[PDB]
Amino acid sequence: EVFNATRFASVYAWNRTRISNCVADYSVLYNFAPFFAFKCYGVSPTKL
Partner 1 sequence: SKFGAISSVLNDILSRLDPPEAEVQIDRLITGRLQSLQTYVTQQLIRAA
Ligand X SMILES: *[C@@H]1O[C@H](CO)[C@@H](O)[C@H](O)[C@H]1NC(C)=O
Contacts to ligand X by CB under 6 A: 4-5, 9, 15, 17, 32
- Tell me: does residue 47 bind partner 1 (CB under 8 A): yes
> 17: closest CA among 34, 6, 3?
3
Q: Least distance in Å: CB of 18 to ligand X? A: 11
Q: Stretches 10-18, 20-28, 30-38, 39-47: which one binds partner 1 (CB under 8 A)?
A: 39-47
For residue 29, report the phi and psi dihedrals to the nearest 5 degrees: -60, -45
Q: Tell me the Cα Rg of the chain.
A: 13
9 binds, among ligand X, partner 1, none (CB under 5 to 8 A by kind): ligand X
